[PDB]
Amino acid sequence: KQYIISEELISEGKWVKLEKTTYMDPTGKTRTWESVKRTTRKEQTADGVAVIPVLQRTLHYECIVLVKQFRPPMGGYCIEFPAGLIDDGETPEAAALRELEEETGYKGDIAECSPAVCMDPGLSNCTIHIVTVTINGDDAENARPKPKPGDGEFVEVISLPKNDLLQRLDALVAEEHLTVDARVYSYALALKHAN
Amino acid sequence: KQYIISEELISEGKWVKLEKTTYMDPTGKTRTWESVKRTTRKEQTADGVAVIPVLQRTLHYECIVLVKQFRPPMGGYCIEFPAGLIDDGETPEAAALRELEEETGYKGDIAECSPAVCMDPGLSNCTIHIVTVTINGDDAENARPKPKPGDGEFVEVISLPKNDLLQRLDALVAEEHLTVDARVYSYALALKHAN
Numbered sequence: 001k002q003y004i005i006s007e008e009l010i011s012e013g014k015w016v017k018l019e020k021t022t023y024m025d026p027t028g029k030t031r032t033w034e035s036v037k038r039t040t041r042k043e044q045t046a047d048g049v050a051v052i053p054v055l056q057r058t059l060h061y062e063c064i065v066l067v068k069q070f071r072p073p074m075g076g077y078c079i080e081f082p083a084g085l086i087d088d089g090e091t092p093e094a095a096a097l098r099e100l101e102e103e104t105g106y107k108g109d110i111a112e113c114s115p116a117v118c119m120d121p122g123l124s125n126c127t128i129h130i131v132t133v134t135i136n137g138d139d140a141e142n143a144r145p146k147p148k149p150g151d152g153e154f155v156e157v158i159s160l161p162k163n164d165l166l167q168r169l170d171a172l173v174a175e176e177h178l179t180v181d182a183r184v185y186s187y188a189l190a191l192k193h194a195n
Numbered sequence: 196k197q198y199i200i201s202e203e204l205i206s207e208g209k210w211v212k213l214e215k216t217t218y219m220d221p222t223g224k225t226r227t228w229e230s231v232k233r234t235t236r237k238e239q240t241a242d243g244v245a246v247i248p249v250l251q252r253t254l255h256y257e258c259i260v261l262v263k264q265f266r267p268p269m270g271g272y273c274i275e276f277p278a279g280l281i282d283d284g285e286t287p288e289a290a291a292l293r294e295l296e297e298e299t300g301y302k303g304d305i306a307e308c309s310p311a312v313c314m315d316p317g318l319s320n321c322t323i324h325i326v327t328v329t330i331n332g333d334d335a336e337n338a339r340p341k342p343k344p345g346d347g348e349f350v351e352v353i354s355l356p357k358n359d360l361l362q363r364l365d366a367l368v369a370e371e372h373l374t375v376d377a378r379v380y381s382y383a384l385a386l387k388h389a390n
């Protein structure tokens with residue numbers, strides 16, 4: 001009932017561009033929006049993947065494997081699902097598994113993969129697949145995960161119990177410029193509400 | 196050990212600006228990032244709020260109150276938690292209850308409120324509080340909720356049972372294409388994952 005009329009390039013970087021979006025509202029009136037888009041999408045179903053890595057161990061509660069990373073847009077460190085762009089010709093599942101191993105060293109198994117879901121629709125067209133990945137933490141390869149030799153990134157790995165995720169997130173994040181990712185927190189919230 | 200070095204304005208719009216961010220990695224090397232920022236943040240705890248509205252009625256499943264609206268950056272419709280900017284001097288909780296009532300007509304009670312969390316930390320500094328808000332659907336107030344939408348806003352309200360959220364989201368999307376918000380999906384996903 002609403003439709004895009006035109007989208008005009010305002011400013012383009014290497015990774016991200018800014019667009020003026022002209023669209024029609026249901027009354028037939030023309031309106032505008034400032035839209036942020038990534039420049040790196042080609043034939044992918046979404047810009048990237050977020051990985052929900054479930055560390056499964058027979059002697060432990062399931063943990064969610066999270067990464068702590070400096071994020072320049074945030075001017076501080078962030079606790080996130082392992083995440084990254086889907087490479088050209090790569091599947092969400094493949095990107096998820098690769099990205100998990102690159103960032104954490106864990107070798108996971110696909111559990112499930114979401115449709116493309118939007119990161120911040122009121123602002124950007126950015127989408128990810130949320131790929132749930134199980135990690136056999138008792139398997140010897142996963143005994144001591146190494147974020148797979150060189151990477152170029154500086155990533156601390158954090159494993160938090162699934163049954164206490166939200167509280168463990170709040171605890172971590174009170175100390176300064178360390179922010180929880182919104183999706184991580186949404187996930188944590190539902191774990192808490194569901195019990 | 197990592198910190199923002201300089202922030203260079205590339206392009207500033209009314210709602211959103213685009214910056215090239217120079218930061219110091221642990222190696223002592225300077226790197227750049229393209230960062231998106233909202234222009235509308237003031238002296239706030241976060242830019243805005245997302246509301247997780249749990250519609251509660253005796254002898255009924257809890258429902259999650261979601262909103263559907265055309266999102267120009269997505270050039271299509273998205274299913275989201277009610278969300279909007281925190282006004283000046285406003286609390287996250289107050290913004291949440293206000294935003295919930297504006298979009299859905301529901302008058303809710305604060306259940307809990309998150310710290311500021313990142314909408315998309317790899318791209319923007321955008322933060323929200325995720326505010327869980329319970330709605331007594333048996334109260335006369337909420338018998339007949341009336342949205343009070345803003346000039347430009349056209350918001351459809353969709354209430355999905357909490358106990359079957361992920362499926363009902365899928366069901367919605369099968370009926371016709373829309374994008375589910377990532378925070379909504381993360382929430383829905385965790386409801387199934389819980390335990």
Ligand SMILES: Cc1cccc(-c2nnc(Cn3c(N(C)C)nc4c3c(=O)n(C)c(=O)n4C)o2)c1
Binds near residue numbers: 032243321322
């Ligand atoms: C922090 C946060 C979290 C979730 C949602 C929001 C948000 N949703 N809408 C707005 C504000 N907004 C309005 N209005 C409220 C009219 N118009 C807008 C915008 C807008 O942001 N842009 C980028 C625009 O281009 N136009 C035209 O903010 C903000």
Ligand SMILES: Cc1cccc(-c2nnc(Cn3c(N(C)C)nc4c3c(=O)n(C)c(=O)n4C)o2)c1
Binds near residue numbers: 084126
């Ligand atoms: C879709 C999605 C969802 C969640 C996280 C990401 C993401 N996180 N990092 C990247 C890729 N990236 C890299 N690298 C992987 C080096 N560098 C970057 C970027 C980058 O996006 N920008 C905006 C940049 O400015 N520089 C410098 O993508 C992508």
